[PDB]
């Protein structure tokens, strides 16, 4: 992601 969820 990272702050991909």
Request: hydrophobic share 0%; proline share 25%.
């Amino acid at each position: 992601x990272p702050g991909c969820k």
